[PDB]
């Protein structure tokens, strides 16, 4: 059994105009998380993690994320394949992920050197999940940008308790 807030139609998710793939490369800190599977948790609050975007020769991204868990750095890797338009992607080697039938990424907005908002949508075990990530080039962002991310998340149907701002750490993510 599972009850999820429905995924928004793609019409409600903007696309970053004139997307420059080479400028989006590098490390981003996850300063905000929102989604239908994301829950606020004051007992064990979400720790900040990082995601590195590297363009390959064929213009796909090698996306490597690192998080601090159980006193160790856990790495996980995926391939974002360019989609129907620039700033859009699908997942490479989807068959290597048990239960996964669909995976979409859309870059909503970015200035490339400070911040970015990225929309994800996937179907896993026939359940449709979506999330929005607030990327920061630094671990801290302005209140204006964080409130913008909150209202965009709310526009896609998510309540406050489905929006989290991970706490900055130094382990694993400063590399
Ligand atoms: C929780 C969640 C929602 C959507 C995604 O695309 C994903 O990777 C994770
Ligand atoms: Cl993964
Ligand atoms: Fe994922
Ligand atoms: Na832990
Ligand atoms: Na401020
Ligand atoms: Na750093």
The residue numbers preceding gaps of C to N over 2.5 A in the chain are none
Total number of domains constituting the chain: 1
Bridging pattern class, strands 72-82 and 163-164: unpaired
Which residues line the annotated binding site?
49-51, 103, 122, 131, 135
Reading the block at residue 153, the tokens are 């998340």
Which residues neighbour 118 within 8 Å (Cβ) at sequence distance 6 or greater?
A: 105, 106, 107, 108, 132, 133, 135
CATH number at residue 6: 2.40.128.20
Which residues neighbour 132 within 8 Å (Cβ) at sequence distance 6 or greater?
A: 32, 33, 34, 35, 108, 117, 118, 119, 120, 149, 152, 153, 156, 158
Hunting for tokens 């790495």 — which residue is that? Answer: 75
Hunting for tokens 């363009």 — which residue is that? Answer: 55
Reading the block at residue 57, the tokens are 């020769």
Query: Which atom of ligand 1 is found nearest the CA of 105?
Result: 6
Q: CB–CB of 131/152 below 8 Å?
A: no
Listed in sequence order, the DSSP H helices in the chain are 143-155
Reading the block at residue 133, the tokens are 């990530």
Q: Hey, which residues does 124 pair with through a beta bridge?
A: 100, 127
Domain containing residue 135: 1-175
Query: Which atom of ligand 1 is found nearest the CA of 121?
Result: 6
Distance separating alpha carbons of residues 149 and 136, to the nearest angstrom: 12
Instruction: Indicate which technique resolved this structure.
Output: X-ray
Hunting for tokens 């080697």 — which residue is that? Answer: 93
Which residues neighbour 4 within 8 Å (Cβ) at sequence distance 6 or greater?
A: 36, 37, 127, 128, 129
Distance separating alpha carbons of residues 166 and 45, to the nearest angstrom: 7
Which residues neighbour 141 within 8 Å (Cβ) at sequence distance 6 or greater?
A: 31, 32, 114, 115, 134
Distance separating alpha carbons of residues 142 and 147, to the nearest angstrom: 9
Q: Nominal resolution in Å?
A: 2.3
């Amino acid at each position: 059994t599972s009850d999820l807030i429905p995924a928004p139609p793609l019409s409600k998710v903007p696309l970053q105009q004139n997307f420059q793939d080479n400028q989006f490369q590098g490390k981003w800190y996850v300063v905000g998380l929102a989604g239908n599977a994301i829950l606020r948790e004051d007992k064990d609050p979400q720790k900040m993690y990082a995601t590195i975007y590297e363009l390959k020769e064929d213009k796909s991204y090698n996306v490597t994320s690192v998080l601090f868990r159980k006193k160790k750095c856990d790495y996980w890797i995926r391939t974002f394949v360019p989609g129907s338009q620039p700033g859009e992607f699908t997942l490479g080697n989807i068959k290597s992920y048990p239960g996964l039938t669909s995976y979409l990424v859309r870059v909503v907005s970015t200035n490339y050197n400070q911040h970015a908002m990225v929309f994800f949508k996937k179907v896993s075990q026939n359940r449709e999940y979506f999330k929005i990530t607030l990327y920061g080039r630094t671990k801290e962002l302005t209140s204006e940008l964080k409130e913008n991310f909150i209202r965009f998340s709310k526009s896609l149907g998510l309540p406050e308790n489905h929006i989290v701002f991970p706490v900055p750490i130094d382990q694993c993510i400063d590399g």
